[PDB]
Amino acid sequence: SALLAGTITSGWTFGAGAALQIPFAMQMAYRFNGIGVTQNVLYENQKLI
Amino acid sequence: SANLAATKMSECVLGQSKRVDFCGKGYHLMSFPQSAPHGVVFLHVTYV
Amino acid sequence: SANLAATKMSECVLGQSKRVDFCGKGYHLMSFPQSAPHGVVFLHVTYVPAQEKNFTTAPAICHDGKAHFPREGVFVSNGTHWFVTQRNFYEPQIITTDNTFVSGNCDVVIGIVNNTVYDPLQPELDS
Numbered sequence: 001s002a003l004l005a006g007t008i009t010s011g012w013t014f015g016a017g018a019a020l021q022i023p024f025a026m027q028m029a030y031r032f033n034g035i036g037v038t039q040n041v042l043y044e045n046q047k048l049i
Numbered sequence: 050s051a052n053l054a055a056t057k058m059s060e061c062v063l064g065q066s067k068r069v070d071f072c073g074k075g076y077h078l079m080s081f082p083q084s085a086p087h088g089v090v091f092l093h094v095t096y097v
Numbered sequence: 098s099a100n101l102a103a104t105k106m107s108e109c110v111l112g113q114s115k116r117v118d119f120c121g122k123g124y125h126l127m128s129f130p131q132s133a134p135h136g137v138v139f140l141h142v143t144y145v146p147a148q149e150k151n152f153t154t155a156p157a158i159c160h161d162g163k164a165h166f167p168r169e170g171v172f173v174s175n176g177t178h179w180f181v182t183q184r185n186f187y188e189p190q191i192i193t194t195d196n197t198f199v200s201g202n203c204d205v206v207i208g209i210v211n212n213t214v215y216d217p218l219q220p221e222l223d224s
Contacts (some may be wrong), residue, residue, distance in 0.1 A: 003082060004092075012063065015064070025208075029156075035063045043166075043206045059116070060117070
């Protein structure tokens with residue numbers, strides 16, 4: 001329950017160092033940017049997610 | 050199997066992984082571990 | 098253990114990895130192998146952020162009625178003016194049209210605020 005917390009809460013930075021504060025709606029935008037999806041898809045379709 | 054189970058925590062859970070059919074089928078977002086007797090249950094969130 | 102060692106001689110030493118807790122804890126820089134009896138001793142050079150400071154953010158800004166989205170970076174604020182900097186460090190700059198992307202209107206994205214996007218071409222054509 002600590003690791004299920006900080007994946008949603010602290011992002012990916014809890015195991016790589018000190019835990020940052022990233023809100024959750026901005027976390028899925030950066031995880032789309034690694035696979036080649038720009039932020040147009042997440043913010044428009046957010047009610048359908 | 051536990052060395053592969055420690056690999057999925059270091060890749061699929063604690064970070065973003067670009068791998069194909071490692072963290073599950075499709076493009077990978079994040080993974081949710083669950084407590085299990087004599088093991089661990091992974092819940093993968095995939096982009097299809 | 099030797100196949101784990103022959104992977105980390107290939108991945109960590111001879112190349113650069115983006116992985117966490119493979120080439121060592123934190124963001125990977127480089128690795129220095131050393132000689133050891135009946136094994137190998139790795140020296141992992143790692144990238145660790147130290148001190149943190151809380152900033153004010155927003156997912157998008159609104160200027161002419163069209164929503165502006167960042168290309169590479171984050172949106173930060175000191176409490177007065179909105180600044181743009183990158184993800185891993187804080188280097189505050191003014192918001193320019195080359196550093197942002199224009200898609201959609203301001204009635205979609207929840208949390209958009211009003212701002213003034215600085216156009217670098219407007220003082221250049223007037224001078």
